[PDB]
Design an enzyme around this catalytic site. Structure first.
Site, PDB file in Angstrom:
ATOM      1  N   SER A 152      46.577  39.380  48.443  1.00  0.00           N
ATOM      2  CA  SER A 152      46.421  39.839  49.823  1.00  0.00           C
ATOM      3  C   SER A 152      46.949  38.813  50.823  1.00  0.00           C
ATOM      4  O   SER A 152      47.814  39.120  51.645  1.00  0.00           O
ATOM      5  CB  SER A 152      44.952  40.146  50.118  1.00  0.00           C
ATOM      6  OG  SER A 152      44.139  39.005  49.910  1.00  0.00           O
ATOM      7  N   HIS A 153      46.421  37.597  50.747  1.00  0.00           N
ATOM      8  CA  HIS A 153      46.890  36.514  51.597  1.00  0.00           C
ATOM      9  C   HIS A 153      47.536  35.442  50.738  1.00  0.00           C
ATOM     10  O   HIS A 153      47.091  35.194  49.620  1.00  0.00           O
ATOM     11  CB  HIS A 153      45.727  35.914  52.387  1.00  0.00           C
ATOM     12  CG  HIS A 153      44.903  36.931  53.110  1.00  0.00           C
ATOM     13  ND1 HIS A 153      45.246  37.419  54.353  1.00  0.00           N
ATOM     14  CD2 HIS A 153      43.752  37.555  52.764  1.00  0.00           C
ATOM     15  CE1 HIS A 153      44.340  38.301  54.740  1.00  0.00           C
ATOM     16  NE2 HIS A 153      43.424  38.401  53.796  1.00  0.00           N
ATOM     17  N   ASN A 154      48.592  34.819  51.254  1.00  0.00           N
ATOM     18  CA  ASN A 154      49.209  33.678  50.583  1.00  0.00           C
ATOM     19  C   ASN A 154      49.595  32.624  51.612  1.00  0.00           C
ATOM     20  O   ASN A 154      50.257  32.930  52.604  1.00  0.00           O
ATOM     21  CB  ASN A 154      50.434  34.105  49.769  1.00  0.00           C
ATOM     22  CG  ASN A 154      50.990  32.977  48.909  1.00  0.00           C
ATOM     23  OD1 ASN A 154      50.329  31.963  48.690  1.00  0.00           O
ATOM     24  ND2 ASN A 154      52.207  33.157  48.413  1.00  0.00           N
TER      25      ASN A 154
END
Length: 309
Positions: free
Chosen positions: A90-92
């Protein structure tokens, strides 16, 4: 004010009935069609950008964790783009720490354990040192039952934008080959089980601050930290040999040093000398996952297949 009343009410859980906007309209005191067109404006303009069901990740059967990779700059970008390819990420972020790549991974049930997924990722990217941290949001009984394939389909088709119409469950019900009454019945049960949380509309420098806190103090500390401007989400996890920080607090400021000051204050007033500021210096990805899509598994097979040699 109508705007104020409407904006306020669509952030509350929207009732599981056939005509939920009729109910909201009554509560607000305006005609439904007028309520509807107004909602659009609020999403069209972007103070609320969406309106959707919120499902509980783990109650869906998803194992999710915060993953950290130790990559060196020469290979940081290459590795980052590999991570982004995963439909479960989802987030990086690139962060200021020996582990310089941090991403959130969510894995669907019955495909592979999360630990296996990251092992294969790290092996493919030739990353030797990585972290697998499971955090819980500090928003301050539910039992996981495996979802049937029907409930998966329900989640699959309902997870997106909530239709701004008089009968927003109707098309979903037709697609599911059932009545609205049968769909709402199932949605209610998922809500009773906590699988469905609710249906609602929802800086310069940033840092994940990590803290080592005695667990009989994390509550108080979490609340103390939550009182500060520049502090958003707080998470907690267990301590471990690989990562001794058990309290996570997302900080933001209009400058790094400004965040440093805020952290130093907290460190001082709460006597917490063990901490680190992991500043976000890059955002490679910030999407939200679609649950029960076929694209993770297909992505996963490819990782397996690419590892065949």
């Amino acid at each position: 004010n109508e705007f104020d009343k409407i904006l306020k009410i669509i952030q509350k859980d929207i009732p599981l009935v056939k005509e939920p906007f009729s109910v909201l309209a009554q509560e607000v005191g305006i005609e439904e069609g007028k309520l509807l067109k107004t909602i659009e404006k609020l999403v069209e303009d972007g103070i609320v950008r969406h309106i959707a069901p919120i499902y509980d990740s783990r109650l869906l059967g998803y194992d999710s964790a915060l993953i950290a990779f130790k990559v060196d700059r020469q290979k940081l970008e290459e590795v980052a783009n590999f991570v982004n390819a995963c439909p479960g990420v989802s987030h990086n972020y690139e962060r200021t720490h020996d582990f310089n790549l941090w991403f959130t991974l969510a894995v669907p049930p019955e495909i592979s354990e999360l630990e296996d997924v990251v092992r294969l990722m790290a092996e493919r990217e030739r990353v030797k040192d990585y972290l697998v941290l499971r955090v819980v949001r500090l928003f301050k009984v539910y039992t996981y039952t495996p979802l049937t394939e029907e409930e998966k389909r329900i989640v699959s088709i309902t997870q997106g934008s909530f239709p701004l119409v008089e009968r927003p469950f109707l098309e979903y019900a037709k697609r599911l080959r059932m009545s609205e009454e049968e769909l709402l019945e199932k949605l209610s049960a998922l809500k009773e089980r906590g699988v469905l949380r609710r249906i609602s509309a929802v800086y310069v420098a940033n840092a994940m601050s990590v803290w080592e806190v005695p667990e009989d103090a994390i509550e108080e500390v979490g609340r103390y930290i939550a009182g500060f401007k520049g502090v958003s989400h707080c998470y907690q996890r267990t301590t471990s040999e690989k990562f001794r920080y058990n309290l996570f607090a997302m900080m933001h400021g209009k400058g790094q040093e400004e965040i440093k000051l805020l952290a130093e204050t907290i460190s001082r007033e709460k006597a917490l000398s063990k901490y680190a500021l992991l500043f976000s210096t890059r955002e490679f990805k910030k999407v939200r996952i679609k649950y029960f899509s076929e694209e993770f598994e297909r992505w996963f097979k490819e990782l397996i297949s690419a590892l065949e040699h």
